[PDB]
Design a protein around this ligand. Structure first.
Ligand code: SF4
Ligand code: CA
Length: 352
DNA sequence: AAGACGTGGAC
DNA sequence: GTCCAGTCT
């Protein structure tokens, strides 16, 4: 970027930003903890989705120390529905490490902050630039689009060599007087103006510096790979009631939807049979199912569940063995369920 | 490294 | 219906 009028670019970008910057809950102050939380929540999740989750989370866990001391169950429930749930296990671990190793002070050194679980190259830039003024780039998906257009970067943005290129662009053009403002403005541009399709280039404060605008190829950029097809996964789910409460179980601490509660379920096309062999395997449990009541798909980034719900009734001769639990209906909202199984419940509840 | 890892705003 | 808003190791 040797012929790039960085100072004029910065002026124009940061004058636009002060006029148009959205009033968002995590912009109300620059507390390193609250900034960090918002930036974890914001990973692969849109601002408007995050807003109510951030507000509730901080009401519940208002300080790094208050989060570090909380039970893992209450932390997970606070994330219920947001997706990519290891973010919150990682953040939880990271705040405990900050509390013990760093005295409850978020490290302002990039290497030390990035060593915390959950903190990748985007989060280290976003948190340190915003809370501490550190001039680290905060290159997210939208920034990569903006910079690919401004500087006509025609390389696949998934490559490390492209990422290094974007990081180098940002270091050359950044306003070291206000790196947090500069980083937020590039993101904000990508969100309200330089959008994936039909960018509002005529409304764009940096149109004069944009090579893709000049050559007329904004919409061919950035260069990404088409997403491959994802495995579809037949999943039989059983909603069982003893009417004396409903049978649920907690998932594994590892892997998909770890530590979330679910209705008993089995992968397969004889769902009625496969589920009966499973539930009976448990201690003192006897079950008989009903005809299915609904079938629906639930998508993940890497696979797609094809859920088939089966209602049924239970008969326990005593305690229900871990990992299983009996829960009165009234008490289900207390547990953390994936969205797929939240739907399972709503479909079974209206089915009556 | 590749692939695992959730969900829905915005259109 | 399709895109796309990051980190693990
Ligand atoms: S002129 Fe258009 S393509 Fe270039 S930065 Fe602005 S909105 Fe994006
Ligand atoms: Ca890191």
């Amino acid at each position: 970027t040797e012929r790039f009028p960085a100072r004029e670019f910065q002026r124009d970008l940061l004058d636009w930003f002060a006029r148009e910057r959205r009033d968002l809950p995590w912009r109300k102050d620059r507390d390193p903890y609250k900034v960090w939380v918002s930036e974890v929540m914001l990973q692969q999740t849109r601002v408007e989705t995050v807003i109510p989750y951030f507000e509730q989370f901080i009401d519940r866990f208002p300080t790094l120390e208050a989060l570090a001391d909380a039970d893992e169950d209450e932390v997970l429930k606070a994330w219920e529905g947001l997706g990519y749930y290891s973010r919150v296990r990682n953040l939880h671990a990271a705040v405990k490490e900050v509390k013990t190793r760093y005295g409850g002070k978020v490290p302002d050194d990039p290497d030390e902050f990035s060593r915390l679980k959950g903190v990748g190259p985007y989060t280290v830039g976003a948190v340190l630039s915003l809370a501490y003024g550190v001039p680290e780039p905060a290159v997210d998906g939208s920034v990569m689009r903006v910079l690919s257009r401004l500087f006509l970067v025609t390389d696949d943005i998934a490559k490390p060599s492209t990422r290094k290129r974007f990081e180098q662009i940002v270091r050359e053009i950044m306003a070291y007087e206000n790196p947090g403002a500069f980083n937020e403005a590039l993101i904000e541009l990508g969100a309200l103006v330089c959008t994936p399709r039909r960018p509002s280039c005529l409304l764009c404060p940096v149109q004069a510096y944009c090579q893709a605008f000049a050559e007329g190829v904004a919409e061919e950029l950035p260069v990404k790979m088409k997403k491959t097809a994802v495995k579809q996964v037949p999943l039989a789910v059983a909603v069982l009631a003893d009417d004396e409460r409903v049978l649920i179980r907690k998932r594994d601490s590892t892997g998909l939807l770890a530590n979330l509660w679910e209705f008993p379920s089995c992968e397969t096309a004889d769902g009625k049979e496969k589920l009966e062999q499973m539930v009976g395997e448990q201690y003192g449990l006897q079950v008989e199912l009903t005809e299915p009541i609904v079938s629906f798909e639930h998508a993940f980034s890497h696979l797609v569940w094809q859920l088939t719900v089966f209602p049924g009734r239970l008969v326990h001769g005593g305690p229900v063995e871990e990992p299983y639990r009996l829960a009165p209906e009234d008490e289900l909202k207390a547990y953390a369920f994936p969205v797929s199984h939240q739907r399972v419940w709503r479909e079974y509840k209206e089915w009556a």
